[PDB]
Write a protein that binds this DNA or RNA. Structure first.
Ligand code: NA
Ligand code: NA
Length: 327
DNA sequence: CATTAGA
DNA sequence: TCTAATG
């Protein structure tokens, strides 16, 4: 956690690199398992050899470890860090819609910069066009203060269309958090569950609503159960207009809301731990349900959940407020 | 780890 | 269809 930080740190850097710039899923995979193990390791790594004794620890990495242990740097690391081409990939990739593949292709064509990016909007698909377009806005955190105003709004339409609609804004926001990156709204409805062969219109009505009033300005992706978009609070009585905010809303089979909702709420560690627990308590948890465990090794049979509670209850725990879902 | 675009 | 990008 700190005794092995640098090593892991350089390691991740290393890894991350093969992955994006190069197409070395392998090496890239190498660096990570190794990064994973040395991380665990209970002691100050003193040399390659020592490290080497490890699992996933080859001679390639031992080597890197020593040079880094000796000199507070790495050549390959310095070289990469410098590398323009490589610097460029790492950067374009910020655009919502640009991933490694496309980042490399763009470079190869010569789009290393944002401007380049612009001159060549034609070379860009709608997801990316918008990624570029709200680039600033997208990089910016979400003041809870605004979170609250947004939420206030969705809740209002959700209900205005059909009153049956259930919506929860999950995420860190839900976990109390001061700021957030984007708003995640978990949607569900009674007339929609496990079986009852969809009802696409269900998603589609609200989207149409939200856009109806100008809360949604753009569509990133919108399908029968997950709409990816762009929202924005009404820029008031002028002088201060609002930043453009990422927003995702999902339709949920009513029969598996709370497990889903439980989950998206996290935190990433609270989950695991929660999950780790259900297991002892003879269970299984995952993104949609919770099934009693059978001693044959495995077992099925999705228990019925009416709220975040049932789920606790089942695994027989203390209901923990979203606020303290930290770990 | 599953859902959407796109070509 | 596969393959990419987001979460
Ligand atoms: Na990106
Ligand atoms: Na393949």
């Amino acid at each position: 956690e700190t005794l092995n930080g640098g090593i892991t740190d350089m390691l991740t850097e290393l890894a991350n690199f093969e992955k994006n710039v190069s197409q070395a899923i392998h090496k890239y995979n190498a660096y990570r398992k190794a990064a994973s193990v040395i991380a665990k390791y209970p002691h100050k790594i003193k040399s390659g050899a020592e490290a080497k004794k490890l699992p996933g620890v080859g001679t390639k990495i031992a080597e890197k470890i020593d040079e880094f242990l000796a000199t507070g740097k790495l050549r390959k690391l310095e070289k990469i860090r410098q590398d323009d081409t490589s610097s460029s990939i790492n950067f374009l990739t910020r655009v919502s819609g640009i991933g490694p593949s496309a980042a490399r292709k763009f470079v190869d064509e010569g789009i290393k910069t944002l401007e380049d990016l612009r001159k060549n909007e034609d070379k860009l698909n709608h997801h990316q066009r918008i990624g570029l377009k709200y680039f600033g806005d997208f990089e910016k955190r979400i003041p809870r203060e605004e979170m609250l105003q947004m939420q206030d709004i969705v809740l209002n339409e959700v209900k205005k269309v059909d009153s049956e609609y259930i919506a929860t804004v999950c995420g860190s926001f839900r976990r109390g958090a001061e700021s957030s990156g984007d708003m995640d709204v978990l949607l569900t409805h009674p007339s929609f569950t496990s079986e009852s062969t969809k009802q696409p219109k269900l998603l589609h009505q609200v989207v149409e609503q939200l856009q109806k009033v100008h809360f949604i300005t753009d569509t990133l992706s919108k399908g029968e159960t997950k709409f990816m978009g762009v929202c924005q609070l009404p820029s008031k009585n002028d002088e201060k207009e609002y930043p453009h905010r990422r927003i995702d809303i999902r339709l949920i089979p009513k029969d598996q809301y709370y497990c889903g909702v439980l989950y998206f709420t996290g935190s990433d560690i609270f989950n695991k731990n929660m999950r780790a627990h259900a297991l002892e308590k003879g269970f299984t948890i995952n993104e949609y349900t919770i099934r009693p465990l059978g001693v044959t090794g495995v077992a099925g049979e999705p228990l019925p959940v009416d709220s975040e509670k049932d789920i606790f209850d089942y695994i027989q725990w203390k209901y923990r407020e979203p606020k303290d879902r930290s770990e």
